[PDB]
Amino acid sequence: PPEPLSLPLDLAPGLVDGDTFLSIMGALPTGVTVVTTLGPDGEPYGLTCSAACSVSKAPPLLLVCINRDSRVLKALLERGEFAVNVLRGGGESTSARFAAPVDDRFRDVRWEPGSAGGVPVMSADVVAHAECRVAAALDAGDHTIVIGAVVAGGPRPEVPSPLMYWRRSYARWPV
Amino acid sequence: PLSLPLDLAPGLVDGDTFLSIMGALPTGVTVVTTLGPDGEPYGLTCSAACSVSKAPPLLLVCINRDSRVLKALLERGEFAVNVLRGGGESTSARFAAPVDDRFRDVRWEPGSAGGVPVMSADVVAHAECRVAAALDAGDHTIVIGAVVAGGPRPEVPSPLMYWRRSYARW
Numbered sequence: 225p226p227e228p229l230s231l232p233l234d235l236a237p238g239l240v241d242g243d244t245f246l247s248i249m250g251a252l253p254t255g256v257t258v259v260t261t262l263g264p265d266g267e268p269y270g271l272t273c274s275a276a277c278s279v280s281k282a283p284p285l286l287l288v289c290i291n292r293d294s295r296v297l298k299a300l301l302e303r304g305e306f307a308v309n310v311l312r313g314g315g316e317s318t319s320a321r322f323a324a325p326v327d328d329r330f331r332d333v334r335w336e337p338g339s340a341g342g343v344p345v346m347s348a349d350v351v352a353h354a355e356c357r358v359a360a361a362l363d364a365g366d367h368t369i370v371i372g373a374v375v376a377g378g379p380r381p382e383v384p385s386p387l388m389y390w391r392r393s394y395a396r397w398p399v
Numbered sequence: 400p401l402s403l404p405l406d407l408a409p410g411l412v413d414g415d416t417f418l419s420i421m422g423a424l425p426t427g428v429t430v431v432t433t434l435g436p437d438g439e440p441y442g443l444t445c446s447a448a449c450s451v452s453k454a455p456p457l458l459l460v461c462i463n464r465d466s467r468v469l470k471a472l473l474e475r476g477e478f479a480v481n482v483l484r485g486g487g488e489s490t491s492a493r494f495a496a497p498v499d500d501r502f503r504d505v506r507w508e509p510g511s512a513g514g515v516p517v518m519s520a521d522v523v524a525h526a527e528c529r530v531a532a533a534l535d536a537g538d539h540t541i542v543i544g545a546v547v548a549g550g551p552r553p554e555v556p557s558p559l560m561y562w563r564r565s566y567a568r569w
């Protein structure tokens with residue numbers, strides 16, 4: 225379970241307060257994903273993650289930013305593969321469930337192993353899922369940036385709304 | 400821009416599959432801005448933007464490697480992230496449009512951080528950032544911004560969002 229290398233950063237004095245930083249970042253609305261993987265054992269691990277975006281089309285890359293300590297991150301880097309489950313409009317308590325300080329997060333959660341090393345796919349709770357080979361990981365401040373090469377996954381056009389978060393409220397597509 | 404070696408699996412999905420998956424992730428809409436060498440304002444529409452770190456306070460943006468806005472941003476070593484609001488549809492289109500002079504008919508003002516263009520109208524908030532690092536990741540450059548200035552507008556009742564080829568408010 226090795227530590228990724230810290231990214232060399234030029235940090236000027238005169239950076240904002242943590243409170244100013246959240247007031248600024250909390251103005252940017254986001255999706256809600258559950259990043260999943262398989263322990264060395266084969267137990268399903270996951271955490272609620274909002275810091276996800278596409279990086280590259282050719283080759284097909286995305287990134288997630290996870291806290292350095294995360295057990296899911298540790299399992300994810302050991303395994304070398306993870307899934308990004310983009311939560312649907314009804315999945316506000318799936319969000320809270322994968323953010324909760326508990327050991328068995330997948331207790332009474334519907335999931336299937338994916339094509340790529342059996343990473344957990346939450347078919348019932350998602351608008352889409354990506355299955356990724358870990359292409360790179362770098363420590364950047366109090367988070368690790370993980371870059372994933374998309375090996376499999378697909379959209380669910382049958383699901384008409386995503387989960388969205390802005391200024392301490394969840395929302396959905398108006399259907 | 401740092402060169403980053405990728406442990407790629409032969410077996411990567413094709414471009415259109417990738418877009419169908421990423422298109423299902425709902426995204427805020429921002430205009431990344433900077434000043435050119437002798438102070439021409441540059442800007443592009445950017446949805447690949449997220450919070451990275453509380454302390455130090457970092458955000459990142461992903462931009463095409465061949466971007467002239469990126470080339471100028473890296474030259475000046477600072478940029479702004481303007482988070483567009485509900486009414487900002489046409490501003491998003493303009494800074495996406497493959498045209499010159501994107502700031503023509505746009506209300507902007509130089510920021511406290513190097514005069515990086517802060518957009519007056521059609522924004523819920525702006526961050527001003529020093530370039531802390533930049534990484535080549537396939538066909539994009541990941542720019543890590545250390546937040547030195549900016550603030551929200553609580554009065555602004557909705558940000559711009561984009562999902563499955565539609566804009567919405569919120």
Ligand SMILES: Cc1cc2nc3c(=O)[nH]c(=O)nc-3n(C[C@H](O)[C@H](O)[C@H](O)COP(=O)(O)OP(=O)(O)OC[C@H]3O[C@@H](n4cnc5c(N)ncnc54)[C@H](O)[C@@H]3O)c2cc1C
Pocket residue numbers: 246247249250252254274275289291366389391392449450451452453
């Ligand atoms: C969208 C979202 C993202 C979150 N990301 C993290 C996280 O990366 N690590 C973590 O430990 N807890 C995270 N949390 C939980 C968070 O720490 C607490 O809910 C926080 O105390 C609430 O502060 P706030 O209302 O100002 O921020 P929120 O309403 O939670 O969101 C403010 C913004 O802070 C950004 N952010 C970046 N790094 C952090 C960080 N270390 N802590 C909090 N917000 C951060 C997020 O992108 C978010 O958009 C997140 C919560 C939400 C809703």
Ligand SMILES: Cc1cc2nc3c(=O)[nH]c(=O)nc-3n(C[C@H](O)[C@H](O)[C@H](O)COP(=O)(O)OP(=O)(O)OC[C@H]3O[C@@H](n4cnc5c(N)ncnc54)[C@H](O)[C@@H]3O)c2cc1C
Pocket residue numbers: 277278279280281417418419421422426446447461462463561563564
């Ligand atoms: C939100 C959004 C983001 C875009 N990002 C880029 C970009 O970073 N670079 C670029 O050259 N063109 C980008 N474009 C332009 C786009 O690639 C073209 O318009 C193309 O025709 C795709 O349209 P589409 O309807 O198939 O998918 P869209 O609805 O245009 O895109 C679906 C999703 O795929 C991702 N995406 C799209 N294009 C790229 C890309 N080239 N690299 C990485 N992720 C991408 C984004 O997450 C987007 O939300 C973007 C367009 C939109 C609407």
Ligand SMILES: Cc1cc2nc3c(=O)[nH]c(=O)nc-3n(C[C@H](O)[C@H](O)[C@H](O)COP(=O)(O)OP(=O)(O)OC[C@H]3O[C@@H](n4cnc5c(N)ncnc54)[C@H](O)[C@@H]3O)c2cc1C
Pocket residue numbers: 428442443444445446447448461462463465466467468469491492494495496497498499561
């Ligand atoms: C909602 C949304 C989100 C997006 N998110 C992203 C994203 O996250 N990342 C991303 O990379 N893209 C993203 N895109 C796509 C991006 O905004 C467009 O591809 C944009 O046109 C790129 O601008 P650029 O300056 O980087 O392009 P460039 O190709 O560098 O230049 C843009 C235009 O400038 C002019 N020009 C070029 N060279 C010169 C010159 N020497 N002198 C004068 N004029 C010149 C030309 O007309 C050229 O077409 C997004 C688009 C949308 C709609």
